[PDB]
Amino acid sequence: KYFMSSVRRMPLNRAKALCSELQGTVATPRNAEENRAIQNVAKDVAFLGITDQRTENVFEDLTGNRVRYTNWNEGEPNNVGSGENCVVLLTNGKWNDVPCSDSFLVVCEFS
């Protein structure tokens, strides 16, 4: 896997479109090593290819596969506000669930 970060912020739909344009997908860390690599390429908070849109509190990657490795920040995921179904990697490498409509950088993953 190769990981690349965008320079501009955008919501999830636009983030998925960007990675897909170059035939990749929004980055999904499968272990601590990949999590660190994605954190490093990202200069600020960035979207990961994980959501619980299909079923609340059931986090899966963009292909529908349930995720095993997770690295939630303390108190997360909390689905606050009117709901948070997308996931971002914080600048400390931990994860926070956020609204898919909000804008963040995007880290794309390619094989």
Ligand X SMILES: CO[C@H]1O[C@H](CO)[C@@H](O)[C@H](O)[C@@H]1O
**Candidate list 13, 40, 69, 110; residue touching a second copy; CB under 8 A:** 110
Q: Enumerate the β-bridge partners of residue 4.
A: 108
Q: How many CB atoms lie within 10 A of CB 84?
A: 21
**Candidate list 3, 42, 88, 97; residue touching Ca ion; CB under 5 A:** 97
Binding to Ca ion by CB under 5 A, coded x per residue (else -) over 27-66, reads -------------------------x--------------
Binding to ligand X by CB under 6 A, coded x per residue (else -) over 26-65, reads -------------------------x-xx-------x---
Q: What does the alpha-carbon distance between residue 40 and residue 86 come to, in Å, rounded to a whole number?
A: 20
Residue 97 interface partner, choices Cl ion, a second copy, Ca ion, none, CB cut-off 5-8 Å depending on type: Ca ion
Q: How many CB atoms lie within 10 A of CB 10?
A: 17
**Candidate list 71, 87, 96, 109; residue touching ligand X; CB under 6 A:** 96
The first and second tokens of residue 46, run together, are: 């960035």
Q: What does the alpha-carbon distance between residue 7 and residue 30 come to, in Å, rounded to a whole number?
A: 24
Asked if the bond preceding 77 is cis, omega within 30° of 0, the reply is yes
Site residues, Cl ion (CB under 5 A) = 85, 99-100
